[PDB]
Amino acid sequence: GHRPVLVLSQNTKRESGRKVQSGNINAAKTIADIIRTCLGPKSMMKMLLDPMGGIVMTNDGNAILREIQVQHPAAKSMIEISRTQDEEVGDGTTSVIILAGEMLSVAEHFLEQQMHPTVVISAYRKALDDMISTLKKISIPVDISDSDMMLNIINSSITTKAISRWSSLACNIALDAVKMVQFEENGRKEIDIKKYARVEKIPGGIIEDSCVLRGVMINKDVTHPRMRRYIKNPRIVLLDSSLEYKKGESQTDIEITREEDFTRILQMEEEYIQQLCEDIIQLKPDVVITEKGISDLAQHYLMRANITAIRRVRKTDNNRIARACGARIVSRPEELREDDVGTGAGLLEIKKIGDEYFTFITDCKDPKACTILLRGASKEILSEVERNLQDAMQVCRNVLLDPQLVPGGGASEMAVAHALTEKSKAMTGVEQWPYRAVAQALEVIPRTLIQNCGASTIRLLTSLRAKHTQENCETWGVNGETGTLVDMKELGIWEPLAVKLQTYKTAVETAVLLLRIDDIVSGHKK
Amino acid sequence: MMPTPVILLKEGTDSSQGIPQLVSNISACQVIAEAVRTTLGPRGMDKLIVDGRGKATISNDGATILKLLDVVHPAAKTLVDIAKSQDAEVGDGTTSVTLLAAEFLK
Amino acid sequence: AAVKTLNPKAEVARAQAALAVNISAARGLQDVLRTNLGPKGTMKMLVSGAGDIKLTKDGNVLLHEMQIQHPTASLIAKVATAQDDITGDGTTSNVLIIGELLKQADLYISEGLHPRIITEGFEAAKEKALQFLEEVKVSREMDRETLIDVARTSLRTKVHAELADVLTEAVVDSILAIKKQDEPIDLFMIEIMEMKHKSETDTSLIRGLVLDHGARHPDMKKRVEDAYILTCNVSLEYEKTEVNSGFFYKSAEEREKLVKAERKFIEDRVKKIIELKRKVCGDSDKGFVVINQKGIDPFSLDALSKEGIVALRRAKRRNMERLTLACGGVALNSFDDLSPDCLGHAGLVYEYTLGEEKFTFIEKCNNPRSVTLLIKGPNKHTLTQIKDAVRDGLRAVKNAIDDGCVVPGAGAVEVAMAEALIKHKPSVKGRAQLGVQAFADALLIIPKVLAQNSGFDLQETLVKIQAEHSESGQLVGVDLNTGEPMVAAEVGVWDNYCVKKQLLHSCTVIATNILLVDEIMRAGM
Amino acid sequence: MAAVKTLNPKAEVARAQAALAVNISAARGLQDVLRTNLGPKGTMKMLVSGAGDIKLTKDGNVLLHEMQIQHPTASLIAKVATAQDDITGDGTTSNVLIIGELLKQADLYISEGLHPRIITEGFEAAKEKALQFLEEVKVSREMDRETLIDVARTSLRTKVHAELADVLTEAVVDSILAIKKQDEPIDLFMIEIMEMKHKSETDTSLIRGLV
Amino acid sequence: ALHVPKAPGFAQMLKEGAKHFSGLEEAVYRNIQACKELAQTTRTAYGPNGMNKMVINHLEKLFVTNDAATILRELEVQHPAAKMIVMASHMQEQEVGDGTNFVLVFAGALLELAEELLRIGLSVSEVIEGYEIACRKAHEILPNLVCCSAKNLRDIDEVSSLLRTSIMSKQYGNEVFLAKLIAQACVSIFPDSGHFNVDNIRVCKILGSGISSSSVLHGMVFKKETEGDVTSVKDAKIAVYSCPFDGMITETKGTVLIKTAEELMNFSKGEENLMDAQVKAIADTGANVVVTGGKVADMALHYANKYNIMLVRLNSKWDLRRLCKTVGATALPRLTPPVLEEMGHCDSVYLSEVGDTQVVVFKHEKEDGAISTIVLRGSTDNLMDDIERAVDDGVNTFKVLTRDKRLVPGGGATEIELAKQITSYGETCPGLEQYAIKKFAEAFEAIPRALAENSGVKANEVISKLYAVHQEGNKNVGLDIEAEVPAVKDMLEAGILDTYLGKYWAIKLATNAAVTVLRVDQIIMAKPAGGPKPPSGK
Amino acid sequence: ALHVPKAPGFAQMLKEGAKHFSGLEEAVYRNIQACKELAQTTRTAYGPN
Numbered sequence A: 001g002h003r004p005v006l007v008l009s010q011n012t013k014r015e016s017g018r019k020v021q022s023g024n025i026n027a028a029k030t031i032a033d034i035i036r037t038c039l040g041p042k043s044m045m046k047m048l049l050d051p052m053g054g055i056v057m058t059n060d061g062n063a064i065l066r067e068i069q070v071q072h073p074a075a076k077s078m079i080e081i082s083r084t085q086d087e088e089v090g091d092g093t094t095s096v097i098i099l100a101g102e103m104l105s106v107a108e109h110f111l112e113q114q115m116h117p118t119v120v121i122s123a124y125r126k127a128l129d130d131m132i133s134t135l136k137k138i139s140i141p142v143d144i145s146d147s148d149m150m151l152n153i154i155n156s157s158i159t160t161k162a163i164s165r166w167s168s169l170a171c172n173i174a175l176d177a178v179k180m181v182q183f184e185e186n187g188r189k190e191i192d193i194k195k196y197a198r199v200e201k202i203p204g205g206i207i208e209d210s211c212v213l214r215g216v217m218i219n220k221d222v223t224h225p226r227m228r229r230y231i232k233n234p235r236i237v238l239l240d241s242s243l244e245y246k247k248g249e250s251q252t253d254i255e256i257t258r259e260e261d262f263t264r265i266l267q268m269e270e271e272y273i274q275q276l277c278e279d280i281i282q283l284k285p286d287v288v289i290t291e292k293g294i295s296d297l298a299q300h301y302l303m304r305a306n307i308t309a310i311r312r313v314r315k316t317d318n319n320r321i322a323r324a325c326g327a328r329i330v331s332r333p334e335e336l337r338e339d340d341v342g343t344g345a346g347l348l349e350i351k352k353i354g355d356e357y358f359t360f361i362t363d364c365k366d367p368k369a370c371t372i373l374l375r376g377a378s379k380e381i382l383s384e385v386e387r388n389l390q391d392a393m394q395v396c397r398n399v400l401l402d403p404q405l406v407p408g409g410g411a412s413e414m415a416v417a418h419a420l421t422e423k424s425k426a427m428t429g430v431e432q433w434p435y436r437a438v439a440q441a442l443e444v445i446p447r448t449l450i451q452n453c454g455a456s457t458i459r460l461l462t463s464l465r466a467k468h469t470q471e472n473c474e475t476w477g478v479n480g481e482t483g484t485l486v487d488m489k490e491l492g493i494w495e496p497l498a499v500k501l502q503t504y505k506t507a508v509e510t511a512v513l514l515l516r517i518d519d520i521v522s523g524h525k526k
Numbered sequence B: 001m002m003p004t005p006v007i008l009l010k011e012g013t014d015s016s017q018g019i020p021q022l023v024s025n026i027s028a029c030q031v032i033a034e035a036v037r038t039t040l041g042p043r044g045m046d047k048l049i050v051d052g053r054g055k056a057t058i059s060n061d062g063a064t065i066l067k068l069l070d071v072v073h074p075a076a077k078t079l080v081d082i083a084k085s086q087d088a089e090v091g092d093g094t095t096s097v098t099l100l101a102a103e104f105l106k
Numbered sequence C: 001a002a003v004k005t006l007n008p009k010a011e012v013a014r015a016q017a018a019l020a021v022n023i024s025a026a027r028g029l030q031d032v033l034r035t036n037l038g039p040k041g042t043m044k045m046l047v048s049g050a051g052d053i054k055l056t057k058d059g060n061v062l063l064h065e066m067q068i069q070h071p072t073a074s075l076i077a078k079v080a081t082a083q084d085d086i087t088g089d090g091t092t093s094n095v096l097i098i099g100e101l102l103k104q105a106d107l108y109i110s111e112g113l114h115p116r117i118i119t120e121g122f123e124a125a126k127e128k129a130l131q132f133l134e135e136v137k138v139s140r141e142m143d144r145e146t147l148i149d150v151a152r153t154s155l156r157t158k159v160h161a162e163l164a165d166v167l168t169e170a171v172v173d174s175i176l177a178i179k180k181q182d183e184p185i186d187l188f189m190i191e192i193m194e195m196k197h198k199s200e201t202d203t204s205l206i207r208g209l210v211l212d213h214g215a216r217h218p219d220m221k222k223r224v225e226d227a228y229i230l231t232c233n234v235s236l237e238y239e240k241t242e243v244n245s246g247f248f249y250k251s252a253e254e255r256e257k258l259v260k261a262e263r264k265f266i267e268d269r270v271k272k273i274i275e276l277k278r279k280v281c282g283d284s285d286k287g288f289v290v291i292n293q294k295g296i297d298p299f300s301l302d303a304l305s306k307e308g309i310v311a312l313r314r315a316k317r318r319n320m321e322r323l324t325l326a327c328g329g330v331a332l333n334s335f336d337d338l339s340p341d342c343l344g345h346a347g348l349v350y351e352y353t354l355g356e357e358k359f360t361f362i363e364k365c366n367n368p369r370s371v372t373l374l375i376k377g378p379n380k381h382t383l384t385q386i387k388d389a390v391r392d393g394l395r396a397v398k399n400a401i402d403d404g405c406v407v408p409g410a411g412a413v414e415v416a417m418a419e420a421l422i423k424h425k426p427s428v429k430g431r432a433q434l435g436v437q438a439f440a441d442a443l444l445i446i447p448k449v450l451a452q453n454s455g456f457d458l459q460e461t462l463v464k465i466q467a468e469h470s471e472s473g474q475l476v477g478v479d480l481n482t483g484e485p486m487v488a489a490e491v492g493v494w495d496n497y498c499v500k501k502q503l504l505h506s507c508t509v510i511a512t513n514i515l516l517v518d519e520i521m522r523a524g525m
Numbered sequence D: 001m002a003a004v005k006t007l008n009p010k011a012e013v014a015r016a017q018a019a020l021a022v023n024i025s026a027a028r029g030l031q032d033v034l035r036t037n038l039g040p041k042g043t044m045k046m047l048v049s050g051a052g053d054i055k056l057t058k059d060g061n062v063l064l065h066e067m068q069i070q071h072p073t074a075s076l077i078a079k080v081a082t083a084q085d086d087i088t089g090d091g092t093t094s095n096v097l098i099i100g101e102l103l104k105q106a107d108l109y110i111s112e113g114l115h116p117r118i119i120t121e122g123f124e125a126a127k128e129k130a131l132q133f134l135e136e137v138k139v140s141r142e143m144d145r146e147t148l149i150d151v152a153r154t155s156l157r158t159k160v161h162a163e164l165a166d167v168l169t170e171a172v173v174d175s176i177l178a179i180k181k182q183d184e185p186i187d188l189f190m191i192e193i194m195e196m197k198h199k200s201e202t203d204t205s206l207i208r209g210l211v
Numbered sequence E: 001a002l003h004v005p006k007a008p009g010f011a012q013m014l015k016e017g018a019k020h021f022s023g024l025e026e027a028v029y030r031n032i033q034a035c036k037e038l039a040q041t042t043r044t045a046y047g048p049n050g051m052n053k054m055v056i057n058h059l060e061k062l063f064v065t066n067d068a069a070t071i072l073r074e075l076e077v078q079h080p081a082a083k084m085i086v087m088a089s090h091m092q093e094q095e096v097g098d099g100t101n102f103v104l105v106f107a108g109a110l111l112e113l114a115e116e117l118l119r120i121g122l123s124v125s126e127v128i129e130g131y132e133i134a135c136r137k138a139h140e141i142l143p144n145l146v147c148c149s150a151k152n153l154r155d156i157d158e159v160s161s162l163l164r165t166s167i168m169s170k171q172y173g174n175e176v177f178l179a180k181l182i183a184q185a186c187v188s189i190f191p192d193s194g195h196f197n198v199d200n201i202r203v204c205k206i207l208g209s210g211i212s213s214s215s216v217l218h219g220m221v222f223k224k225e226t227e228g229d230v231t232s233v234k235d236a237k238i239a240v241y242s243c244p245f246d247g248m249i250t251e252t253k254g255t256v257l258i259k260t261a262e263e264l265m266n267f268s269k270g271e272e273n274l275m276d277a278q279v280k281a282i283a284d285t286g287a288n289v290v291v292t293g294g295k296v297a298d299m300a301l302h303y304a305n306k307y308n309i310m311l312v313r314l315n316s317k318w319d320l321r322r323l324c325k326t327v328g329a330t331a332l333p334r335l336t337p338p339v340l341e342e343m344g345h346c347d348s349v350y351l352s353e354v355g356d357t358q359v360v361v362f363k364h365e366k367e368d369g370a371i372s373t374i375v376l377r378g379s380t381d382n383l384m385d386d387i388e389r390a391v392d393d394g395v396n397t398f399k400v401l402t403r404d405k406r407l408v409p410g411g412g413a414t415e416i417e418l419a420k421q422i423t424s425y426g427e428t429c430p431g432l433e434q435y436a437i438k439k440f441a442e443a444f445e446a447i448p449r450a451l452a453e454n455s456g457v458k459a460n461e462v463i464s465k466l467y468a469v470h471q472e473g474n475k476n477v478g479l480d481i482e483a484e485v486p487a488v489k490d491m492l493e494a495g496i497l498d499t500y501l502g503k504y505w506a507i508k509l510a511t512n513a514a515v516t517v518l519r520v521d522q523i524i525m526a527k528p529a530g531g532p533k534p535p536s537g538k
Numbered sequence F: 001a002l003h004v005p006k007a008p009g010f011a012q013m014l015k016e017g018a019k020h021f022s023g024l025e026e027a028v029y030r031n032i033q034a035c036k037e038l039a040q041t042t043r044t045a046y047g048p049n
């Protein structure tokens, strides 16, 4: 007995002082170093072993970061900012991580030099505002109608992925999907590619056969063999309620005392099913899609009217069909109207791919939803192609919402760094040194590009910095392949302004958040 | 005999072949016959067997004594089986059959 | 390591370690699968954890049944699985080409060359190789002889010579039976049924259906000559009310009346069937067969048997389509309006009993659009091997029918492609010529492995074949009996064009992706 | 599985291509580690012993001795390099590199179904021809001070830093010329190597006497 | 330098519990050794002089038998090549019913001789081709070795003589009596219709009086008791009901609703009156015996006893079907009285006690009926099981004879003639397959050699004498087991004959199994698992 | 597909307790960090203060 007495519970560790700051900055730098080599057109693949047995081959920084598990909370914050960057704009996930790591690394110096973190944070915020101003200044407009320019933008977005050799087909697919998904209702513009731009992967075939359909495709088959698998101009009716006899939600009990009541009940069930089928037929459709089961008797009654029917379809797939073919999902067939009947799909085909049946509602006229049929070598290759297509569609949506572009290949970073350095000459306070530190730390992107390209970092970066000190050289970047300085007005590597703004904001605020941290406490439960 | 990494039968299989196993079978039959040997005749004596639960069975019947014996020897079980057969078909002579069979084997 | 610093229990291989691990795994898989290629290959035996015995020669089956826990092995297995799922053949060639591509790439990477140039050369060589494959394919009208040749080139590689010869006729006849002009072939209409009572050479084609179940009433006829087939999906057994009814009576007589009354619903449908049978055939010469996808209670079975009707219950779901296509009837989900025009016809129906399981044969159809393949063998593993072989043969024949072209086999196309790639190499700009050369050498693996399996030496046979091809310009392959160059087209050694194109595309893609991997990570814990 | 394991269940055996693959892997690993040693532009290796002693070295034989390796083929290569160092005192890294490259090149053709024996006759014939050519190409000179200084440079510059090697060249050449007797074998035991730990590395020199 | 690492590649990629065997020595020779070991294990039970084997399975169940198939089934065989040999033997048993030991002996001999051929320098492909050619030649030769046909199957003595050779290997001491029993049982069944059903033979095992007291009954015997007072009927008119002998009830739900006192008073009386009326209506048709497949109600039993109706309850549906076949009735689904076509007739049905077992007997007097039952007596359960196995072998031999009437001489004569002619054929075959053909011919020597070894004489002298006699021009001479000195005698006169179809199928299956084993070159066994059996096997 | 095997060559031949740090990031940066840490520990005792 006579147990020890103490203030806090056991296993409640606590670390304080500059050691905490050093550990946090080191964790951020380690996170940056993990994916430093996955930046630029010459980035290499990385293989990730899923805990459940899967394998992920990816170049995306967000996927790599989210596929690993870390214990240090600063690394957790880095993973969180990578996920935030991926969710917001779509790409730039590794660039923001690299920038945040570099900013924290250069703030470590001033932390060593007795400067309080609050001064560093204020300088960081001033630098962020000035970078926002410069990025908005050096932007250029883009016309939406110019399809070639959009294709070039998507190409420059996907040159760093593994789909760079099929870039033309990938850009066409992404542009068509983003344009055709674009929708407006009640004066509210909407580009919802998460729900109405579905990417379906079927291993096999060749990637050149992959295409975006003017419709939707589902992994479903007809309920009965006697049912047509090819209809020229189908009239689609969508249902989300079962076409079978089911009990009510109230506790109902029958009490049979006469001979003919049992058969009467069974015939009443059959007649109720026939009534529902007749209500459906009254609109004279061609195909019927339901999210719940369809009884065999209902199938017979539907076939009697020469009507195709798919038994069980997911909610999201049914919504995609409704958007594509202009149908409206209804629950009670008695409430069905002519307007709810979906016309607009120019062909319905149920063909066999490999050893599995697939239903196509393609050939629609003005459809608002799509499926992206992806074919390739294997499942991992198709997953990586899907990730690249997601990045392309996100970039296309960002350009559609914001028609501004800024030069790529490190040109924007160098131009903003030069502007920040020039503005820093006016300040006389102590805040100028972290300001210039942020300015030069922003130069990590071209340095990483040169390092990945294999060229010499020091002389190329010095020449680029000297070039950016001239009058009109804001578009001078670095080739990610030949390792030479080139004007981006000729190379054409442009990236959306929104992506760059989000990257800079996220990096600066991650540095700010990790700079405020001190007195780490751990071990307590909830 | 070699370990033979891949083996024919299941590991732990016991096999006995030849004259020695037949001699052992005969000896087991004699052992079984000895357990009911003294229960034969007007001067015969009873045997008491206690089970796991503690119940005691006192009997002069050869078939009952053999049944209460928990024989596991494959050759010895034949004597118990023929004692049961004699009890079923006749009802008397259950002690004589085991003695006769064991004496034949001896 | 940074990853180990962040996660202490992390396994990481970086830079040359990643390439070494991937190439070692690929070369191990290739070394295992070298002996599979060609009809002269060696059968491999697979024993599962439960002691099940599996004799096979297919690449995909062997890959799935190897006890391997390697990432690159999993990637190659997925690639081969896609290959088998789409084309049905070429898995062993897929693995061999992937392994040899990686080995040839390493041969240059180990000398300081960067893998990116190797990948660029691989892709340029792949484009040129696809062009050459388009230029070399033989567009032919797919008559019976060409399909027999293709089925032979598959089955002889997969099974014994005589068994392959039988399966060629079986598969070709089945495909010709189910195929309609200018219409996609549905392989679901060929039922592969296994019986385990006779020899492997007894496998045959029944131009009809074979069902794994028989009539459950002992008094039903065991053989009907002229039959009217009634395929249906109607429950003929007692069904309970959906609303939880139950019965309420006050005397034994009322209970008897309720018992007699609750069967009226099913008895009405049974009476409809009986009346249709009576109307259709008024004599005892013709017969009536009822195949139901749902159960039939003993009362309905007795009622049907009292009218001389054979009833089969709990049939397979696809059997409805198969019977409607073969017999020619109409599948029914209800008996609301049943007419003689919806009845199928079969020229002979009989039941065969084998041990505890019974089978029903439906043959002599007027023009069966759906047929069945009956696999017969003395062992389960023999049945599995024959099923795999007939699947491969059906896939090959279907591919030949779809793609009107066909590519000469025996490695002749590989040699010609390698020669064309070597000739085209000077046109490639930069150091990608090394990648082009590596791609050509990797393509040359198929004749090498064929010669090695046939027992000859790689170098002499390969140089002889290449010299003959250069001198004559023909498509000379490998003669597995003599080792001399031989025109594969003339002798009938054919390969699927789609299979070759898929091999090229998938192998190049996976090799390029693996070559660019510089780090394997395991930090999900 | 094998014949050996039938008699000795706890026996480790590699047969046919397995043994060749094991040997090639070990040789290639040793060559990969020792590649960076060759030439004056090589990199230092820091070798920490179990007790914690620090040894910075570039010599192939010394580096092999301080390897934490338990491989048979590595042991054979180490013995060969040890004999090389014992008799000639140089060429250990080149020894390991040449052995590894020979094995790799031989495996390159063996993987094509070729028997290793033919490679062995090729190797012996090529060795004979190479020895003849080496006899043809050698440069016979009068070993004056300049040639000895050049040889000492070509060794020490690889072994140590530039200016340190420059000092050691003069030291070694002067010592050898001091103890050398005309047309007599050179007794290297007569050059005592004494070390002190009080000055810089460039303060090492030669004493025309004994310490 | 004190450890040998695993070679890079497949060796390291293998799982921890897996094993990989490849090449000749590691795979083919090991499989041949295992198959030879299995064949040597089973060899001692071949022929009439074969000894029984005590086999204890995992459930500690006794088994005494010289039947190769049963021994193989009750051995936990772990080597997969031996598993293929065992399943080939089981296939032979399923197809024919006899010759399993022949299958094992031939497969083992073929595999040892193939191992010898591989050692001397032949390739696996050459050995396989030679074995296939020799098997084809043997199949061609076999019809020429047929000595005589059955030529009559409705006869009693001739069928018994034919089956004597089949059931002489098992229970060698007393095969004449068992031959007569099985002959009578098989001749009662097998009507003018050519089809013969093995399942129509029923074996009832009641111990107590030795196997010499066994008999054959033209009917069925059930180890049950009558549920009523009547225990003997002389002019039985069995009515068979699949439904329980009770008032039927609704399948949905039965709830007696009472609203007045009169209904409560009269419900039980009405139910009992309905039961009495139903039972009396059943009895009025003349059905004095009632057999039901379900439970029997108390009131129904009382009213059946009131009307002098014999009650027998058969729980097994197979027994009900067999009784319907024997008597000639129809299992009614309801309790309605049976019409004259559904009313079965048996000449005598009664309750009797055999030994210390109460049985119900449905006995016919005519030498006809769909099903005949053999009642077996004895002193030990294991001995009676062995007698049942011998009876099964005899019935399978009769079924084979119905399928094919051709017979070949036994006692090794057929094997010696086959070996001689295959050797003669192979001596004229140029090429490397002559060695394989000669070895296939020599593999036939293992049958007479095993017979001679089991009989206790020198095998070499017997084989030399057999070759001499076959060379001088006698093809029907085999091993004479009734002699202390190696001697031979003509087997056509002795009546020791084997079914041609059985030998043909056994040769085919043994050759196929040997070839299949030889084709295997690599083995990849997964880590063994102690799982609770495959789901298919339950 | 759940474990990363050791790379063939030097990694497999390494002893069970040995460590091998090679390259710039794995060796030089770690050594510089250790030296900086030692200097940090001793720094505060410099000078009269």
Ligand SMILES: Nc1ncnc2c1ncn2[C@@H]1O[C@H](COP(=O)(O)OP(=O)(O)O)[C@@H](O)[C@H]1O
Binding pocket: A038, A039, A040, A041, A043, A060, A061, A091, A092, A093, A094, A095, A096, A156, A157, A159, A160, A407, A408, A409, A410, A449, A478, A479, A480, A481, A493, A495
């Ligand atoms: N062809 C090119 N030449 C030079 N730089 C390029 C080229 N293509 C892309 N970049 C640069 O690489 C960056 C994209 O790299 P990426 O791997 O997509 O990183 P993130 O995932 O963070 O966007 C862009 O900032 C762009 O400036």
Ligand SMILES: Nc1ncnc2c1ncn2[C@@H]1O[C@H](COP(=O)(O)OP(=O)(O)O)[C@@H](O)[C@H]1O
Binding pocket: C036, C037, C038, C039, C058, C059, C089, C090, C091, C092, C093, C094, C153, C154, C156, C157, C408, C409, C410, C411, C450, C477, C478, C479, C480, C493, C495
């Ligand atoms: N009779 C033959 N003569 C020569 N070559 C053949 C013959 N049959 C098949 N081949 C060649 O051997 C190869 C067999 O490959 P196969 O074992 O089927 O691999 P996969 O099953 O992965 O397709 C084919 O590419 C074909 O070109």
Ligand SMILES: Nc1ncnc2c1ncn2[C@@H]1O[C@H](COP(=O)(O)OP(=O)(O)O)[C@@H](O)[C@H]1O
Binding pocket: E045, E046, E047, E048, E050, E067, E068, E098, E099, E100, E101, E102, E103, E165, E168, E169, E170, E409, E410, E411, E412, E451, E478, E479, E480, E481, E496, E498
């Ligand atoms: N009386 C006999 N004399 C000599 N040989 C016999 C006699 N009876 C049977 N055989 C031989 O014994 C063999 C039967 O062996 P058996 O134990 O039945 O094995 P299986 O059950 O596998 O057929 C037959 O081939 C036959 O030639």
Ligand SMILES: [Mg+2]
Binding pocket: A091, A092, A093, A157, A160
């Ligand atoms: Mg990007």
Ligand SMILES: [Mg+2]
Binding pocket: B092, B093
């Ligand atoms: Mg007494």
Ligand SMILES: [Mg+2]
Binding pocket: C089, C090, C091, C154, C157, C392
């Ligand atoms: Mg194939």
Ligand SMILES: [Mg+2]
Binding pocket: D090, D091, D092, D155, D158
């Ligand atoms: Mg040196």
Ligand SMILES: [Mg+2]
Binding pocket: E098, E099, E100, E166, E169, E393
């Ligand atoms: Mg027998």
